[PDB]
Write a protein that binds this ligand. Sequence first.
Ligand SMILES: [Mn+2]
Ligand SMILES: [Mn+2]
Ligand SMILES: [Mn+2]
Ligand SMILES: [Mn+2]
Ligand SMILES: [Mn+2]
Ligand SMILES: [Mn+2]
Ligand SMILES: [Mn+2]
Ligand SMILES: [Mn+2]
Ligand SMILES: [Mn+2]
Ligand SMILES: [Mn+2]
Ligand SMILES: [Mn+2]
Ligand SMILES: [Mn+2]
Ligand SMILES: [Mn+2]
Ligand SMILES: [Mn+2]
Ligand SMILES: [Mn+2]
Ligand SMILES: [Mn+2]
Ligand SMILES: [Mn+2]
Ligand SMILES: [Mn+2]
Ligand SMILES: [Mn+2]
Ligand SMILES: [Mn+2]
Ligand SMILES: [Mn+2]
Lengths: 103, 105, 78, 83, 97, 98, 94, 99
Amino acid sequence: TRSSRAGLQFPVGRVHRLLRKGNYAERVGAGAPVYLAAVLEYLTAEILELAGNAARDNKKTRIIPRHLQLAVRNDEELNKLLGRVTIAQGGVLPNIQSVLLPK
Amino acid sequence: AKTRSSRAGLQFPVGRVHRLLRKGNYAERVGAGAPVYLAAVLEYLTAEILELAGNAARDNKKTRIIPRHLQLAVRNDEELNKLLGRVTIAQGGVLPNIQSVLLPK
Amino acid sequence: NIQGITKPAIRRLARRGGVKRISGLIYEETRGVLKVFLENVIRDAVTYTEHAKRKTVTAMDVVYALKRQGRTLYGFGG
Amino acid sequence: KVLRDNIQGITKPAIRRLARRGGVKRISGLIYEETRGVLKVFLENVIRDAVTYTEHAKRKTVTAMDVVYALKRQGRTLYGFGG
Amino acid sequence: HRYRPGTVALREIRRYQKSTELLIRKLPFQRLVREIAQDFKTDLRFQSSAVMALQEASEAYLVALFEDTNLCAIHAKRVTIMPKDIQLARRIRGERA
Amino acid sequence: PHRYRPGTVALREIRRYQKSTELLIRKLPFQRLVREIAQDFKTDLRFQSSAVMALQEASEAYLVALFEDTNLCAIHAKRVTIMPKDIQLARRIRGERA
Amino acid sequence: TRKESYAIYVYKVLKQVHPDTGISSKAMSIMNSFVNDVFERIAGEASRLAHYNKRSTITSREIQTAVRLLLPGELAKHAVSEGTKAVTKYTSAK
Amino acid sequence: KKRRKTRKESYAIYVYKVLKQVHPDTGISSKAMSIMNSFVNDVFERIAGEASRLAHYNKRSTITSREIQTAVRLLLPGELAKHAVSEGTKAVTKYTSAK
DNA sequence: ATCTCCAAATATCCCTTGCGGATCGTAGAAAAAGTGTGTCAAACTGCGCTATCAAAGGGAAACTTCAACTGAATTCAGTTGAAGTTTCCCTTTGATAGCGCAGTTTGACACACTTTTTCTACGATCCGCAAGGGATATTTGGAGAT
DNA sequence: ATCTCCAAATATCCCTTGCGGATCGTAGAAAAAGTGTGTCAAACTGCGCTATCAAAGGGAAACTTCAACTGAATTCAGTTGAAGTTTCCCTTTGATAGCGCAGTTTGACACACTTTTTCTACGATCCGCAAGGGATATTTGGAGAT
Ligand SMILES: [Mn+2]
Ligand SMILES: [Mn+2]
Ligand SMILES: [Mn+2]
Ligand SMILES: [Mn+2]
Ligand SMILES: [Mn+2]
Ligand SMILES: [Mn+2]
Ligand SMILES: [Mn+2]
Ligand SMILES: [Mn+2]
Ligand SMILES: [Mn+2]
Ligand SMILES: [Mn+2]
Ligand SMILES: [Mn+2]
Ligand SMILES: [Mn+2]
Ligand SMILES: [Mn+2]
Ligand SMILES: [Mn+2]
Ligand SMILES: [Mn+2]
Ligand SMILES: [Mn+2]
Ligand SMILES: [Mn+2]
Ligand SMILES: [Mn+2]
Ligand SMILES: [Mn+2]
Ligand SMILES: [Mn+2]
Ligand SMILES: [Mn+2]
């Protein structure tokens, strides 16, 4: 498998097929799906790393959508990347405006 | 009739539109009626903006359409404003509009 | 049917959005805003359903419609 | 020669003219530095993408198209300069 | 015993921001969806997840809107959201002219 | 000597600028700023003159429209004067960050 | 080299609608951006529709539902009838 | 057999693999997995979409790792972009070695 | 009420240009024709999942009671931004010259695509059992009263 | 501050169910092989970009003055939220009816593709002339003064 040659868990062969069928261009070079598979793998790692921690913090061993949302919105860069995405069953960050709290 | 535009009753170029559809990687195949339909849609939208912009030009005692007229046209029309809601027309300026509270008393 | 979106339900929505105090007129505005939101999404979702020559609105029809509106949703077939 | 502090070339009267066009009657003295900061962030974001297009094309000259493409990328489509 | 006005509201805020449950009851929401759809095309069925997709999108939308509505209320030195705050938020979002 | 009341000239400035379409930021200054910001991303860049004009068209348009939203925020708070907090409220609701 | 534009067609449609009105160079460049932009938006949406439905071809049906997704209200209605009328007239010939 | 339900494809196994790499003792619910699959699909479409425009803009017929790279630079915010460019460059370097 | 006066509007003169309308000659692309081929329409079908039904209980929504605390109005004064004036910085304008580099071009080929055969990864499907659900009890964090 | 007193957080324990691993079976990825064209590297080149200077003068900066704006402070009517009672309808559970989605097969014909003919649309170029648009002087609408 091309994934093994590249050091990746994500499927270089599937990614290549999907690029060929998505009508992005006439031709796809051989490095393209490797590069792309690697980037998709890196981002799923980045998200899963922070969500795992949010699961830990919430005293749970299973990542649920809430932990994915916590991870995303507490992370400046992931929050930007997913700035127009809604995670189903994620809820919101705990946030109360100062002026609403009693003195 | 020779040209496909002529056959379709169209000013816009059916053959160019077909080629542009084929060379834009939109799908493997383009059907024969696709470029006719799209050429016609493009022609219609250009007629609509040009009509409204010529009227703006005349409102302004002018004989030639400049970007300002295109802008006045687009933003005084609800549907064109919406279609071009995220578009900037270079040298268009804005519509005359002062909020009430800012006028003297 | 729009009245099935009750005052308490709208209050709960507002609480999640961080609202402490709500004018009596909010409940009617909200219903109008939600109606507009649903009409726009459902309009598009139904255009997709019809284009596929189907009689059944799929979650994908909704997902694609939400994507068109710049309201991408994860969790239902993205 | 070194370019520095060129944001200060976005003068107060210039910012005031833009605000007039935007319909603004009265302007706080604090607006001008707020506006500079905002413009800086706007240009950094568009220019950053525009330069990425230039680099990709193996060119050393930022073309109008690199900017038009960057503007489109940012949901700020511009008409009048090609494309 | 009586909690002061706002104390229970504040408790409620804390409660709902910790959870992820849909806050509109499921059946009234379903009826609304079907009524709106009928207006566009008669004789439609829905996948159950289609309705759920719409409810998740709708609530996400309204919650975020109330966040912006709240900021506009606060901007005006008030603590109470009013229709005008919704209208200002929607104007700035470019949802409304 | 004659003196217009405060706000009279401001109103006529609005009318003046709302009628015209010319760029309102001096041209060489804008071009230096562009060039400085670009150099911080890549040294040795040249610019087509139309590239800089496109950026000035977009920038002024962005800022005019932000000033419209800012004014609505000021009016909402029962003022006629735009303040930094109006621009901030406007950018926050737009989803603009940094 | 050749720079292709929609200019001559925009000129023609302008003469139909406003026979004694000219158009400035910058106004025309704007009209060219406009036509290209709408082409892109429509072709893009049509592309998605064929993919979503597993078809290999963009037909006028894809163009048509793309038009209905993209254009508001009255504008979609008239574009649809202009588009359908043109496909009808075109098939009627060969 | 004979009549076969169409095979659905997802990223679920590679996501679970990566999850074991980063959190050996952490699991994932099926709703969370669905979100993760949407994420991967959304990001794939966004990147290949730029790469496609890039090739078109430059009159080229091929999407190469170069288009993927600049597309990642357009799409991703600062640090994420830096890290994704490293990882993509390294995978490509490693892959072209392995013959 | 009525006059004074400032700047935007209107009127006049010349004049640079940038438009529509030419004619040109010509590259490149569209149309025309001929043949190859794979997409998708239709028809028949099987069954997943959508709609529906009947009932019942329990909790949510609606309604009612009360008054706390909020939004809105009023007044007023220090703060501050607008208007106008004066000085002169540095932008604008125009024109020159040098060359950096964008864009065209042409041979060689490395790389991607297409085709066919073999191999094996990832899909569907299955279910023991551990994480989380749900119920009950106890502890802890505060809010409101005195 | 200190005591009362709610409600959320935490603890504890038994039940439920969907995670996650294991099993079988194939669609799709890889290997191998033969084919061509897009890409790349290298040669030459003239557009327009950088730069620079000069001359003039438009507009920026920095000042004084003070009008009127912001916002602080105060007041209170009433619209809110909290907690009571009453009324309604959502959800849950167990299928049964059957719509219409989606699986399978197929050959006609719509669309590809490649070659030759026809003609559109481009780039280069002069031309009449209203269309502005800049420089110079006069009248006008109304803001502010008397
Ligand atoms: Mn029916
Ligand atoms: Mn620098
Ligand atoms: Mn780890
Ligand atoms: Mn001309
Ligand atoms: Mn030829
Ligand atoms: Mn108050
Ligand atoms: Mn009141
Ligand atoms: Mn004071
Ligand atoms: Mn001051
Ligand atoms: Mn000075
Ligand atoms: Mn070069
Ligand atoms: Mn447990
Ligand atoms: Mn529990
Ligand atoms: Mn305590
Ligand atoms: Mn599972
Ligand atoms: Mn196979
Ligand atoms: Mn070579
Ligand atoms: Mn001056
Ligand atoms: Mn009272
Ligand atoms: Mn049937
Ligand atoms: Mn008079």
